PDB file of C-alpha atoms in Angstrom:
ATOM      1  CA  UNK Y   1       0.032  -0.367  -0.032  1.00 22.70           C
ATOM      2  CA  UNK Y   2       2.730   2.413   0.650  1.00 21.85           C
ATOM      3  CA  UNK Y   3       5.946   3.173  -0.986  1.00 25.21           C
ATOM      4  CA  UNK Y   4       9.343   2.197   0.435  1.00 23.50           C
ATOM      5  CA  UNK Y   5      13.216   2.229  -0.542  1.00 21.81           C
ATOM      6  CA  UNK Y   6      15.926   0.880   1.550  1.00 21.56           C
ATOM      7  CA  UNK Y   7      19.437   1.236   0.480  1.00 16.66           C
ATOM      8  CA  UNK Y   8      22.666   0.780   2.358  1.00 19.82           C
ATOM      9  CA  UNK Y   9      26.254   1.465   1.473  1.00 16.84           C
ATOM     10  CA  UNK Y  10      29.752   1.029   3.882  1.00 16.38           C
ATOM     11  CA  UNK Y  11      31.833   3.969   3.932  1.00 15.33           C
ATOM     12  CA  UNK Y  12      35.161   3.454   5.073  1.00 15.45           C
ATOM     13  CA  UNK Y  13      35.779   5.758   7.231  1.00 14.65           C
ATOM     14  CA  UNK Y  14      35.224   6.311  11.160  1.00 13.72           C
ATOM     15  CA  UNK Y  15      31.497   7.365  12.069  1.00 11.51           C
ATOM     16  CA  UNK Y  16      32.713  10.987  13.305  1.00 11.05           C
ATOM     17  CA  UNK Y  17      33.705  11.947  10.059  1.00 10.88           C
ATOM     18  CA  UNK Y  18      30.642  10.125   8.253  1.00 13.61           C
ATOM     19  CA  UNK Y  19      28.080  11.740  10.479  1.00 15.95           C
ATOM     20  CA  UNK Y  20      29.418  15.228  10.125  1.00 15.43           C
ATOM     21  CA  UNK Y  21      29.516  14.877   6.636  1.00 16.21           C
ATOM     22  CA  UNK Y  22      26.394  13.680   5.922  1.00 17.12           C
ATOM     23  CA  UNK Y  23      24.528  15.987   8.130  1.00 18.14           C
ATOM     24  CA  UNK Y  24      25.985  19.195   6.867  1.00 19.90           C
ATOM     25  CA  UNK Y  25      23.069  20.646   5.459  1.00 16.05           C
ATOM     26  CA  UNK Y  26      24.700  23.533   3.946  1.00 16.41           C
ATOM     27  CA  UNK Y  27      27.375  21.069   2.003  1.00 17.95           C
ATOM     28  CA  UNK Y  28      24.647  19.061   0.442  1.00 19.55           C
ATOM     29  CA  UNK Y  29      24.773  20.936  -2.921  1.00 18.11           C
ATOM     30  CA  UNK Y  30      28.479  19.650  -3.389  1.00 17.84           C
ATOM     31  CA  UNK Y  31      27.367  16.464  -1.887  1.00 18.44           C
ATOM     32  CA  UNK Y  32      24.111  15.486  -3.896  1.00 18.56           C
ATOM     33  CA  UNK Y  33      23.810  15.608  -7.331  1.00 21.08           C
ATOM     34  CA  UNK Y  34      20.179  16.750  -7.047  1.00 21.63           C
ATOM     35  CA  UNK Y  35      20.294  19.699  -4.729  1.00 24.59           C
ATOM     36  CA  UNK Y  36      21.444  23.143  -6.039  1.00 25.45           C
ATOM     37  CA  UNK Y  37      20.575  25.109  -2.987  1.00 26.74           C
ATOM     38  CA  UNK Y  38      20.390  23.631   0.645  1.00 23.83           C
ATOM     39  CA  UNK Y  39      19.860  26.116   3.642  1.00 26.84           C
ATOM     40  CA  UNK Y  40      18.771  25.901   7.062  1.00 26.41           C
ATOM     41  CA  UNK Y  41      15.669  28.043   7.761  1.00 28.95           C
ATOM     42  CA  UNK Y  42      15.222  27.757  11.185  1.00 28.55           C
ATOM     43  CA  UNK Y  43      16.621  25.492  14.170  1.00 32.92           C
ATOM     44  CA  UNK Y  44      14.806  25.315  17.213  1.00 33.62           C
ATOM     45  CA  UNK Y  45      15.709  22.697  19.476  1.00 36.68           C
ATOM     46  CA  UNK Y  46      16.918  19.559  18.549  1.00 34.36           C
ATOM     47  CA  UNK Y  47      15.199  19.324  14.944  1.00 39.54           C
ATOM     48  CA  UNK Y  48      15.316  21.979  12.225  1.00 39.46           C
ATOM     49  CA  UNK Y  49      13.480  23.390   9.069  1.00 36.44           C
ATOM     50  CA  UNK Y  50      15.512  23.599   5.742  1.00 38.46           C
ATOM     51  CA  UNK Y  51      14.616  24.259   2.210  1.00 38.78           C
ATOM     52  CA  UNK Y  52      15.852  22.518  -0.426  1.00 40.33           C
ATOM     53  CA  UNK Y  53      16.263  23.520  -4.203  1.00 43.37           C
ATOM     54  CA  UNK Y  54      16.794  21.017  -6.770  1.00 44.03           C
ATOM     55  CA  UNK Y  55      18.702  21.689 -10.292  1.00 46.04           C
ATOM     56  CA  UNK Y  56      17.006  21.326 -13.471  1.00 46.98           C
ATOM     57  CA  UNK Y  57      15.850  17.693 -13.548  1.00 45.14           C
ATOM     58  CA  UNK Y  58      15.538  15.707 -16.669  1.00 45.46           C
ATOM     59  CA  UNK Y  59      12.990  17.754 -17.754  1.00 44.55           C
ATOM     60  CA  UNK Y  60      14.208  21.326 -17.182  1.00 44.53           C
ATOM     61  CA  UNK Y  61      12.349  21.743 -14.496  1.00 44.76           C
ATOM     62  CA  UNK Y  62      13.755  23.253 -11.029  1.00 43.38           C
ATOM     63  CA  UNK Y  63      11.867  21.886  -7.560  1.00 43.90           C
ATOM     64  CA  UNK Y  64      12.056  23.628  -3.876  1.00 43.73           C
ATOM     65  CA  UNK Y  65      10.460  22.549  -0.980  1.00 43.69           C
ATOM     66  CA  UNK Y  66      10.603  22.603   2.798  1.00 41.50           C
ATOM     67  CA  UNK Y  67      11.563  19.603   5.167  1.00 41.48           C
ATOM     68  CA  UNK Y  68      12.025  19.275   8.761  1.00 45.28           C
ATOM     69  CA  UNK Y  69      15.063  17.130  10.189  1.00 44.19           C
ATOM     70  CA  UNK Y  70      16.107  15.743  13.673  1.00 43.42           C
ATOM     71  CA  UNK Y  71      19.437  14.470  13.709  1.00 42.80           C
ATOM     72  CA  UNK Y  72      20.235  11.963  17.071  1.00 42.43           C
ATOM     73  CA  UNK Y  73      24.042  11.821  16.938  1.00 44.11           C
ATOM     74  CA  UNK Y  74      23.728   9.956  20.494  1.00 44.03           C
ATOM     75  CA  UNK Y  75      21.526   7.267  18.841  1.00 44.80           C
ATOM     76  CA  UNK Y  76      23.461   7.803  15.385  1.00 43.76           C
ATOM     77  CA  UNK Y  77      20.206   8.059  13.922  1.00 40.74           C
ATOM     78  CA  UNK Y  78      18.160  10.824  11.973  1.00 40.34           C
ATOM     79  CA  UNK Y  79      14.307  11.179  11.321  1.00 39.62           C
ATOM     80  CA  UNK Y  80      13.188  13.801   8.609  1.00 41.43           C
ATOM     81  CA  UNK Y  81      10.022  14.632   6.284  1.00 43.46           C
ATOM     82  CA  UNK Y  82       8.779  16.803   3.886  1.00 41.61           C
ATOM     83  CA  UNK Y  83       6.606  19.754   5.416  1.00 37.69           C
ATOM     84  CA  UNK Y  84       5.710  20.990   1.612  1.00 40.75           C
ATOM     85  CA  UNK Y  85       4.639  17.603   0.345  1.00 42.67           C
ATOM     86  CA  UNK Y  86       4.266  18.774  -2.945  1.00 44.57           C
ATOM     87  CA  UNK Y  87       3.336  15.389  -5.050  1.00 45.21           C
ATOM     88  CA  UNK Y  88       3.806  13.248  -2.260  1.00 44.63           C
ATOM     89  CA  UNK Y  89       1.012  12.492   0.340  1.00 45.46           C
ATOM     90  CA  UNK Y  90       3.608  12.083   2.663  1.00 43.19           C
ATOM     91  CA  UNK Y  91       7.559  11.579   2.567  1.00 44.11           C
ATOM     92  CA  UNK Y  92       9.503  10.268   5.428  1.00 47.20           C
ATOM     93  CA  UNK Y  93      13.042   9.826   5.859  1.00 43.99           C
ATOM     94  CA  UNK Y  94      15.099   7.309   8.275  1.00 44.33           C
ATOM     95  CA  UNK Y  95      18.960   7.044   8.239  1.00 46.06           C
ATOM     96  CA  UNK Y  96      20.846   4.975  10.520  1.00 46.15           C
ATOM     97  CA  UNK Y  97      24.674   4.791  10.889  1.00 44.72           C
ATOM     98  CA  UNK Y  98      26.471   1.710  12.088  1.00 41.86           C
ATOM     99  CA  UNK Y  99      29.991   0.563  12.950  1.00 43.88           C
ATOM    100  CA  UNK Y 100      30.926  -2.272  10.625  1.00 47.60           C
ATOM    101  CA  UNK Y 101      34.281  -4.211   9.809  1.00 50.69           C
ATOM    102  CA  UNK Y 102      35.583  -1.872   7.443  1.00 48.28           C
ATOM    103  CA  UNK Y 103      34.465   1.782   8.177  1.00 48.09           C
ATOM    104  CA  UNK Y 104      30.551   3.113   8.539  1.00 48.07           C
ATOM    105  CA  UNK Y 105      27.321   1.486   7.335  1.00 47.15           C
ATOM    106  CA  UNK Y 106      24.770   3.998   5.884  1.00 46.03           C
ATOM    107  CA  UNK Y 107      21.057   3.007   5.993  1.00 44.56           C
ATOM    108  CA  UNK Y 108      18.648   5.168   4.260  1.00 44.11           C
ATOM    109  CA  UNK Y 109      15.178   4.516   4.174  1.00 43.04           C
ATOM    110  CA  UNK Y 110      12.202   6.169   2.764  1.00 39.40           C
ATOM    111  CA  UNK Y 111       8.540   5.814   3.144  1.00 39.04           C
ATOM    112  CA  UNK Y 112       5.975   7.834   1.325  1.00 42.37           C
ATOM    113  CA  UNK Y 113       2.488   7.727  -0.973  1.00 43.40           C
ATOM    114  CA  UNK Y 114       2.106   9.923  -4.024  1.00 40.90           C
ATOM    115  CA  UNK Y 115      -0.772  12.212  -4.227  1.00 36.74           C
ATOM    116  CA  UNK Y 116      -3.583  10.793  -6.490  1.00 34.78           C
ATOM    117  CA  UNK Y 117      -2.956  13.012  -9.687  1.00 37.94           C
ATOM    118  CA  UNK Y 118       1.003  13.332  -9.244  1.00 36.58           C
ATOM    119  CA  UNK Y 119       2.791  12.469 -12.504  1.00 37.45           C
ATOM    120  CA  UNK Y 120       4.605   9.850 -10.765  1.00 40.79           C
ATOM    121  CA  UNK Y 121       2.600   6.495  -9.467  1.00 41.98           C
ATOM    122  CA  UNK Y 122       4.249   4.773  -5.891  1.00 40.49           C
ATOM    123  CA  UNK Y 123       5.581   2.034  -8.506  1.00 40.79           C
ATOM    124  CA  UNK Y 124       7.810   4.569 -10.792  1.00 37.73           C
ATOM    125  CA  UNK Y 125       8.569   7.004  -7.873  1.00 33.71           C
ATOM    126  CA  UNK Y 126      10.109   3.875  -6.239  1.00 34.90           C
ATOM    127  CA  UNK Y 127      12.436   3.118  -9.086  1.00 36.65           C
ATOM    128  CA  UNK Y 128      13.480   6.469  -9.376  1.00 38.76           C
ATOM    129  CA  UNK Y 129      14.592   7.103  -5.880  1.00 41.08           C
ATOM    130  CA  UNK Y 130      16.245   4.137  -5.527  1.00 41.17           C
ATOM    131  CA  UNK Y 131      18.689   4.793  -8.805  1.00 44.99           C
ATOM    132  CA  UNK Y 132      19.168   8.548  -7.346  1.00 42.65           C
ATOM    133  CA  UNK Y 133      19.796   7.317  -3.863  1.00 43.98           C
ATOM    134  CA  UNK Y 134      21.902   4.723  -4.897  1.00 46.91           C
ATOM    135  CA  UNK Y 135      23.934   7.391  -7.172  1.00 46.62           C
ATOM    136  CA  UNK Y 136      24.055   9.795  -4.016  1.00 46.86           C
ATOM    137  CA  UNK Y 137      25.137   7.287  -1.515  1.00 45.03           C
ATOM    138  CA  UNK Y 138      28.097   6.069  -3.958  1.00 37.85           C
ATOM    139  CA  UNK Y 139      29.114   9.354  -4.413  1.00 42.69           C
ATOM    140  CA  UNK Y 140      29.049  10.106  -0.889  1.00 44.92           C
ATOM    141  CA  UNK Y 141      31.123   7.407  -0.178  1.00 44.00           C
ATOM    142  CA  UNK Y 142      34.040   8.468  -2.353  1.00 42.19           C
ATOM    143  CA  UNK Y 143      33.796  11.813  -1.037  1.00 46.07           C
ATOM    144  CA  UNK Y 144      34.262  10.779   2.576  1.00 43.18           C
ATOM    145  CA  UNK Y 145      36.587   7.976   2.167  1.00 41.25           C
ATOM    146  CA  UNK Y 146      38.846  10.708   0.512  1.00 41.95           C
ATOM    147  CA  UNK Y 147      38.668  13.234   2.948  1.00 42.11           C
ATOM    148  CA  UNK Y 148      39.598  10.668   5.171  1.00 39.11           C
ATOM    149  CA  UNK Y 149      42.586   9.049   3.331  1.00 42.53           C
ATOM    150  CA  UNK Y 150      44.129  12.549   3.134  1.00 42.57           C
ATOM    151  CA  UNK Y 151      44.511  12.810   6.911  1.00 45.23           C
ATOM    152  CA  UNK Y 152      46.792   9.698   6.925  1.00 45.54           C
ATOM    153  CA  UNK Y 153      49.625  11.546   5.517  1.00 46.18           C
ATOM    154  CA  UNK Y 154      50.141  14.481   7.179  1.00 45.31           C
ATOM    155  CA  UNK Y 155      49.339  12.534   9.453  1.00 45.74           C
TER     156      UNK Y 155
END
């Protein structure tokens, strides 16, 4: 009934670095290939609201929306959801980090459902999100590992 994506990847670096990089919202435009802009609108208490402005998609359209995000470094997890759902009836995000043999494993899970009349149906969006998510996790993994390996020669 409800759409879902579940993707994992291991980053060959320590939790601290993996966490700090991925949770650096201001840097997402250089980390993610889809976001042109990312700014925190407000930070009240734990969670916070941020705006995302994507780059022109495969159809030349630029999207922008606001989401609420609540990072929990202590539990090594983060929860988020779109405030301006747009074509989505709702979109929930859940990231976890786990120490494993070789580095830090990142697991990103999405829970959503398209609005009746949206350009995409649950099936097609699921495929689209898996593709973009996998591409982003691989790019982020590379970036983090490079920063990590750099600090091993100064040391």
